[PDB]
């Protein structure tokens, strides 16, 4: 499959927030 | 105007007609500005509008 | 309707032989001893029910909120609590002990417990779907669900359609299991059948909901 | 009972009555029971 639309800035950043490291 | 007029027991339907028959035409812009702040003045205007109406309002003109 | 109940712990299965020499595969349930810790009522709590506390736990692993809830009924702290939704909860009393022999031979019970877990079960194993055949040239879909809806009308997958998800490890209630024998010395219950959950689980045994 | 939009008397004893918004014919000869619908 292929992305139907360019992802809106809000939606892109909602997700990348989840890609965070944990404090040891 | 309709809310304030119904507080004094006259519907907006006929409060306007009475005002016409008293030649006291005063814009709605400011006729609604009296109801909020100066209730007495609006109360004094419904009195005029009620007495300027015909006795029986539904009889043939 | 009146419902007697008791917590147990499935221990395993074995077989017995009734007087007519008919193999009867039974499951050994170590039910009891369990004590009433609280009795609900229409006025205090709205409905009629009865807690019973079964288990063995040293007083050092019980936090104070529960350690004070047990001291109201004056019973040593147990580890598992449950309610039996009954209709005669006014006949119980705090601290009353419900022994294993609440049931007698022949009575039918409704055993309940957490079924065994199965992980993220696939389509076939969890809904008994069929496949697309191993042979005759099936391209990488030997175990696929198949289709999941129609074309542009409705253009949407219906809610409640059967997919693959986490199976098992959910509450299950087997019904009208027969209580073969009640060995009151050890406090066991020989029940003809297969109660839910793995060995060591916390089963509940209450009287037949049906047939009353 | 015969279900027909056209409900008519067949003999004299037939009585045309209106029950529950539906016109039916009641008669001693059970064959003449008729209901409109």
């Amino acid at each position: 499959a292929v992305p139907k639309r360019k992802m809106s800035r809000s939606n892109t950043r909602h997700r990348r927030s989840q890609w965070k490291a944990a404090v040891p | 105007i309709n809310a304030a007029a119904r507080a004094n027991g006259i519907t907006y339907n006929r409060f306007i007609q009475g005002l016409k028959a008293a030649n006291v035409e005063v814009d709605r812009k400011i006729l609604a500005e009296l109801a909020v702040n100066d209730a007495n003045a609006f109360a004094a205007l419904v009195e005029v509008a009620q007495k300027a109406l015909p006795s029986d309002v539904n009889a043939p003109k | 309707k009146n419902i007697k109940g008791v917590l147990g712990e499935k221990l395993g299965m074995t077989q017995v032989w009734d007087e007519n020499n008919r193999v009867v595969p039974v499951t050994v349930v170590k039910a009891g001893p369990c004590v009433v810790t609280q009795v609900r009522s229409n006025d205090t709590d709205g409905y009629e029910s009865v807690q019973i506390a079964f288990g063995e736990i040293d007083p050092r692993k019980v936090n104070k909120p529960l350690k004070g809830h047990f001291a109201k009924a004056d019973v040593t702290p147990r580890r598992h609590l449950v309610e039996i939704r009954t209709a005669d909860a006014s006949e119980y009393t705090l601290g009353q002990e419900i022994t294993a022999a609440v049931f007698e031979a022949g009575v039918k019970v409704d055993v309940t417990g957490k079924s065994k877990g199965k992980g993220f079960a696939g389509v076939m194993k969890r809904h008994n779907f069929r496949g697309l055949g191993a042979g005759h040239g099936t391209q990488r879909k030997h175990r696929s669900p198949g289709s999941i809806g129609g074309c542009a009308t409705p253009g949407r997958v219906f809610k409640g359609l059967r997919m693959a998800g986490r199976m098992g490890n959910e509450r299950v209630t087997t019904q009208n299991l027969t209580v073969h024998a009640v060995d009151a010395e050890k406090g066991l219950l020989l029940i003809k059948g297969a109660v839910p959950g793995p060995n060591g689980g916390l089963v509940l045994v209450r009287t037949a909901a049906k047939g009353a | 009972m015969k279900v027909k939009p056209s409900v008519k008397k067949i003999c004299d004893k037939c009585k045309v009555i209106r029950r529950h918004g539906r016109v039916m014919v009641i008669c001693d000869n059970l064959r003449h029971k008729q209901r409109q619908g």
Binding site: - | A3, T11, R14, E33, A39 | F158, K159, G160 | -
Partner: protein
């Protein structure tokens, strides 16, 4: 000059009790929705809630004209296929009268995020007793004008 728009503190909500004893259901809802929406006082604005709390006692004795009691349904679909479940008002008004009056008033109000805030000011009860006795509610009769 600019026409007065009420600020948060110009509103002084009151409490009205509408005894619905043998009063038409539709005329109960319209009267309750007028008060709820705050559309009877000169401080009305279309973007702020100015209405008054409306308690409703005797919500089980709403008179219903004609064959409505046995013909009018109340449909409710769940999302799953074949999930439509309807209820005759004979059944609905028998054991859940409050849930039928509150549904009627809900329809007679905006379906936006403010109409749901207005609708929270309407308490419906089946008896003659409402717990809201500390709010000093004022009985509210239903009257017409000339």
């Amino acid at each position: 000059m600019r026409t007065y728009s009420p600020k948060p503190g110009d509103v002084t909500r009151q409490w009205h009790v509408i005894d619905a004893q043998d009063v038409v259901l539709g005329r109960l809802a319209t009267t309750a929705a007028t008060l709820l929406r705050g559309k009877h006082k000169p401080i009305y604005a279309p973007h702020v809630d100015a209405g008054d709390f409306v308690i409703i006692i005797n919500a089980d004795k709403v008179h219903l004209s004609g064959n409505k009691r046995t013909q009018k349904m109340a449909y409710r679909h769940s999302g799953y296929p074949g999930g439509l479940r309807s209820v005759r008002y004979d059944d609905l008004l028998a054991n859940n009268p409050e849930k039928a009056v509150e549904k009627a008033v809900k329809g007679m109000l905006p379906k936006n995020s403010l109409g749901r805030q207005m609708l929270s000011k309407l308490k419906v009860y089946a008896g003659e007793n409402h717990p809201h006795a500390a709010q000093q509610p004022v009985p509210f009769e239903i009257t017409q004008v000339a």
